[PDB]
Design a protein around this ligand. Structure first.
Ligand SMILES: N[C@@H](CCC(=O)O)C(=O)O
Ligand SMILES: N[C@@H](CCC(=O)O)C(=O)O
Lengths: 444, 444
């Protein structure tokens, strides 16, 4: 068990899938390098920047309480109890940043609403979370999957992919995502050959059995995926084992992640993926690349990350001059949303501070007893330009506390020796794509 | 807001859907007469009987803390906080009886496992709840829907109903129930014409739109339903509005309930339903029929129940001689499971009492600090003959804390002037049915 507790005048809770789900029985597995560690560090980086900002919360130091979810909603609920213990060692929590997986964000939201704690997700896209009658303290820097499903149905309609197979991860992301896709597909006269579900529970079929079901309909060469990152790897690995070749059309769960395709680049060649439209935070790259196990002792998972990333041991022995750089690192696509989520919470607290304490820069008596209801409704639904790092760059929430439906379309290609994801299109309300730039496995 | 707090040496928590979900926005609606009030009263009756029993917990008085779930998992979580407050006015809770809907039992279980509180459901049939790695403190007097789905697929296979439509309630009961059915159907060469989902969330279609989808496949005259009681009424009402005629094959969600069919008996004629194999508790009938608003003041919802049931007001004025009797009352099918769940908890506590306090009948020092882990694992998985009321009548749990897969098959018929559900078959591991006794709408 591990955590990050940095004391401050106001403390922000944080939830990241630092570790994957453990195999068989174990709660926690391997370190999730890109969607775990990087995202965690993007929150720490944003907190550091805000604490250096003389225009945003001067006189109010932001502390943190960051916990691992181990990519499980059950594990995340146990961890989330620590954020509410001080309302029932435990510190008071102003707001919560996370989680990543929609199921954990849902579980956490069910608990947090009972303590009027505002919650901002930087990656949870389930349309379920747009229900304000149920998730009254929830907001997100990301859009609902109502739009991603539409974007995917429009891609198939554009290429006349009228007879397709679907595979979905069981849970809050995959099931509602594919249900939304199936409605949009039907409105566009797109038929579904087979609809498979994957996941761990006793009711699911094997990944090899799912691949066998996909090959049983050779007519459907395009497979639409609304799946989790961990489930996506298992499916590809299964496709690779039986040398199954399909044109994968995948949601943000896969996105532009190299971890899903490393080792099985052949079986995933020509894949079309979506990811939320984002731009890299250049200052984060500088910050992340400067981290090493000798200077980073506030992150208790950093040593495990380092040993996994570089295939090492401390006390092959880890070389002292090992460094995170452009040769072994790429900024995770949703980092922009993590920084924006921390900044959204900061801007809402600054505005409440300037309203309730006009006489000081400090946490006045009128603000010591924080009103989560008012913080959420009267402040958090605000407006700001993307955090002192950016060249619609405004951070805001709609009536439902959601971000804007903007996606980038990617194609898994070879470029020039190196396998990568090339941006080949965009979706904002309509689909735009550069068809000539796409490589489909073998030509077409 | 209302509750039942009866102080005792050991207190049992209780969760019942006393009220339906409220329309539009309101949390609570009409009183749920049969699956709400009757079930609540069956727990109170069992507690009264145990407190009169000189062989089961003599010297240990059983108190209660019974709350309304308003047929919502969100509402049930808020109410369940009251059971754990005394571990964080609030009383200590030995075990929890409920809930009814699988989604509420799931939400409650997520919370209770964190406080090592044993939970026994008398009606939650979701196969999800058999996962002991996730629901480690959960047991139930009822079986998982792995069996009901099989029982339903075997009924269709028996009648050569090879091209059917399905309708499922969104949520933990309907979705996994129909997913299990779809696997069993496929193993029996049964094809699914259309698969509709119903429910309240923003993603679901109208009940009228679902009926329109069913009529669009006239070939599929048999419609399989894995749906909640409240959703079942809405679907029938919709079928009745457009005079849609189908052969309904429904899960226990519909069961042998008259409330689902009252007013729309014509559209549901010839329906085949399943319900868990049970026998009425004769002593409960005596107890329930003796209740009136002048003697029942421990139940704060009884006055609302009385006014709804009899179309009354207190201070048409309610006639003082109004009585619950065989002319206006029938024992709810799952009452046996409520009494057994209370008795299961009592027998586990008695056995722990006799093990830790052999010297007394009282709650000794070695038992004042209750160990929920040991209570669940070492005692609750026990053996007893159905509570001093019965003519396999044993109350026990399998390795997964589940009851036995035994179902009764019913047919909605006219009998002789009166519309009712006639038992026409049974499923225990194989299907047995009396085909000649079945009335299908118009002859066949
Ligand atoms: N959008 C995903 C999570 C995104 C991510 O981890 O990159 C979900 O709804 O679970
Ligand atoms: N078996 C149903 C509830 C049973 C009932 O209320 O009669 C469920 O899984 O939700």
């Amino acid at each position: 068990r591990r955590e990050i507790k940095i004391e401050g005048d106001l403390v922000l809770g944080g939830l990241f899938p630092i570790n994957e789900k453990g195999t068989g029985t174990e709660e926690c597995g391997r370190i999730n390098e890109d969607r775990g560690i990087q995202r965690l560090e993007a929150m720490l980086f944003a907190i550091d920047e805000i604490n250096k900002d003389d225009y945003l919360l001067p006189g109010v130091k932001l502390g943190v309480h960051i916990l691992d979810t181990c990519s499980r909603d059950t594990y995340a609920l146990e961890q989330s109890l620590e954020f509410v213990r001080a309302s029932l060692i435990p510190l008071l929590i102003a707001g919560v940043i996370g989680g990543s997986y929609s199921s954990v964000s849902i579980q956490v939201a069910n608990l947090l609403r009972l303590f009027q704690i505002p919650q901002i997700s930087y990656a949870s896209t389930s349309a379920k979370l747009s229900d304000k009658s149920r998730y009254d303290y929830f907001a997100r820097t990301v859009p609902p999957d109502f739009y991603q499903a539409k974007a995917m149905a429009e891609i198939l309609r554009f290429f006349n992919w009228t007879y397709v197979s679907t595979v979905a991860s069981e849970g809050d992301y995959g099931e509602t995502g594919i249900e939304a896709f199936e409605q949009e597909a039907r409105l566009r006269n797109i038929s579904i050959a087979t609809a498979e579900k994957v996941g761990r529970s006793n009711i699911r079929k094997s990944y090899d059995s799912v691949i066998r079901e996909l090959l049983q309909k050779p007519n459907a060469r395009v497979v639409v995926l609304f799946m989790r990152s961990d489930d996506s790897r298992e499916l590809i690995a299964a496709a690779s084992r039986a040398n199954a070749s399909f044109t994968w059309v995948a949601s943000d769960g896969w996105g532009a992640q190299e971890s899903i395709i490393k080792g099985s680049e052949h079986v995933a060649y020509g894949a079309i993926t979506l990811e939320l439209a984002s731009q890299p935070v250049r200052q984060f790259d500088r910050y992340f690349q400067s981290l090493n196990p000798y200077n980073n002792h506030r992150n208790p998972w950093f040593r495990d990350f380092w040993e996994q990333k570089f295939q090492c041991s401390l006390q092959r022995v880890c070389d002292k001059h090992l460094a995170i750089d452009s040769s072994n690192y790429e900024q995770e696509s949703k980092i922009m949303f993590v920084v924006n989520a921390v900044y959204a919470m900061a801007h809402a607290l600054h505005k409440m501070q300037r309203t309730l304490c006009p006489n000081t820069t400090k946490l006045c008596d009128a603000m010591k007893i924080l009103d989560g209801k008012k913080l959420y409704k009267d402040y958090l639904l605000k407006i700001n330009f993307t955090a002192p790092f950016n060249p619609d760059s405004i951070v805001k929430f709609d009536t439902f506390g959601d971000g804007m439906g903007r996606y980038n379309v990617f194609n898994f290609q070879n470029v020039g020796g190196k396998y990568s994801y090339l941006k080949v299109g965009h979706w904002a309300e309509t689909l735009s794509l550069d068809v000539n730039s796409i490589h489909w496995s073998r030509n077409s």
